[PDB]
Amino acid sequence: LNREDLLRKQRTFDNGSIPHQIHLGELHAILRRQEDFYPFLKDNREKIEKILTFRIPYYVGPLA
DNA sequence: ATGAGACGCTGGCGATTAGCTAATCGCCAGCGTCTCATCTTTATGCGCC
């Protein structure tokens, strides 16, 4: 209780510190471990990586 | 050369039967962050028609 880790759930409030890099790492690992079977995700793994990596610049604004 | 005209317990109960806002108060209110830039504006400090 004093160490604040008593029965903590998984989807909690402290996840705001989690960067996107580790999710991208786990994504690349899953893709590389599954690209040896299916051809389409082996072909479009960099597309999915682009989906996760894509961030609209602040100077662009609305994509109207 | 005769055969119509003249019409009731209700009111005062109960007792069904049916139906409706209003006055008082309490509760309780989606919120969390960051980045990035962007401009202002203020406090003080310096100049004479």
UniProtKB/Swiss-Prot annotation:
Monomer. Binds crRNA and tracrRNA. CRISPR (clustered regularly interspaced short palindromic repeat) is an adaptive immune system that provides protection against mobile genetic elements (viruses, transposable elements and conjugative plasmids). CRISPR clusters contain spacers, sequences complementary to antecedent mobile elements, and target invading nucleic acids. CRISPR clusters are transcribed and processed into CRISPR RNA (crRNA). In type II CRISPR systems correct processing of pre-crRNA requires a trans-encoded small RNA (tracrRNA), endogenous ribonuclease 3 (rnc) and this protein. This is CRISPR-associated endonuclease Cas9/Csn1. It comes from the Bacteria. Belongs to the CRISPR-associated protein Cas9 family. Subtype II-A subfamily. It comes from Streptococcus pyogenes serotype M1. Disruption phenotype: Loss of correct processing of pre-crRNA and tracrRNA. Loss of immunity against a plasmid with homology to CRISPR spacer sequences. Coexpression of Cas9 with an artificial single guide RNA (sgRNA) which fuses the crRNA with the tracrRNA in human cells has shown it is possible to target and modify DNA sequences of interest. Cas9 plus the 2 sgRNAs have also been expressed individually in human and mouse cells to achieve DNA targeting; cleavage efficiencies of the artificial sgRNA were lower that those for systems with the 2 sgRNAs expressed separately. Microinjection of Cas9-encoding mRNA and a synthetic sgRNA into zebrafish embryos induces targeted mutations. Has 2 endonuclease domains. The discontinuous RuvC-like domain (approximately residues 1-62, 718-765 and 925-1102) recognizes and cleaves the target DNA noncomplementary to crRNA while the HNH nuclease domain (residues 810-872) cleaves the target DNA complementary to crRNA. Has a bilobed architecture with a recognition lobe (REC, residues 60-718) and a discontinuous nuclease lobe (NUC, residues 1-59 and 719-1368). The crRNA-target DNA lies in a channel between the 2 lobes. Binding of sgRNA induces large conformational changes further enhanced by target DNA binding. REC recognizes and binds differing regions of an artificial sgRNA in a sequence-independent manner. Deletions of parts of this lobe abolish nuclease activity.
